[PDB]
Structures are given as structure tokens and as C-alpha cells.
Design a binder for this molecule. Structure first.
Ligand code: HEM
Length: 84
């Protein structure tokens, strides 16, 4: 039973205390990654709660970073929130 979030709840996690992001319709808690993030600490906080999809793809991220993504996954965006 995969879990769901809602953009709204996602959005509440705009801090360093707790960092969430949405990439390709999956939510993540990046909280712990920041320090590891080769491209920056500030870039991500710059988009907490946000759907950085467009952003992360516009910076080109590798398959390796993609794979890294799997460890910070917390769920997917609510279907009803999915934008089709
Ligand atoms: C969990 C989310 C993210 C993960 C796991 C991740 C991972 C990585 C990794 C592994 C690299 C180094 C080389 C590569 O694999 O391409 C990298 C570089 C970088 N990423 Fe991220 N990234 C994430 C989110 C973002 C976002 C949202 C942005 C922009 C808003 C961003 C901007 C950058 C920049 C600027 C660099 C390095 C400088 C450059 O290559 O231009 N990253 N990231």
C-alpha cells in the first residue's frame, strides 16, 4: 500500500528542519541529503515543498543521482493532485 501526500501537506515542509520536494510525482524528504548535495545546500532549500521537477531536469542530473533519489522517497503525490 503505497502512501500519498497532498501538495498542501507537501508544502508545509519548506524548512531545513524538514525538507520535502516533489520530483516526477513522488515526494521525498531531502532533509538529510543537503550536505551531500554536490550542487548545493541552497538550491534545494530554495525549493522546499516545491515540485522541483522542472528544475532538476533543467540542471541535468545523472542516473546515479536518480538512483540516489530512491533513498529519500516518502511517497507519491495524490492522484487527485496529479495534473493531467
Ligand atoms: C533529491 C534531489 C536531488 C538529488 C538526489 C541530486 C543529486 C545530484 C548529484 C548526484 C549530482 C552530481 C552529478 C550528477 O549526478 O549529475 C548533482 C549535481 C547538481 N544538482 Fe542535484 N540533486 C537533487 C536535486 C537538485 C535540484 C532540485 C537542483 C536544482 C534546483 C539541483 C541542482 C544541482 C546542481 C547545480 C548540481 C551541480 C552543478 C551542476 O552540475 O550544474 N539538484 N545533484
Amino acid at each position: 500500500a503505497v502512501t500519498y501526500y497532498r501538495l498542501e501537506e507537501v508544502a508545509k515542509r519548506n524548512t531545513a528542519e524538514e525538507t520535502w520536494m516533489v520530483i516526477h510525482g513522488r515526494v521525498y524528504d531531502i532533509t538529510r541529503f543537503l550536505s551531500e548535495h554536490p550542487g548545493g545546500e541552497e538550491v534545494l532549500l530554495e525549493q522546499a515543498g516545491a515540485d522541483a521537477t522542472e528544475s532538476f531536469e533543467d540542471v541535468g542530473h545523472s542516473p546515479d543521482a536518480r538512483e540516489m533519489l530512491k533513498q529519500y522517497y516518502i511517497g507519491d503525490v495524490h492522484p487527485n493532485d496529479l495534473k493531467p
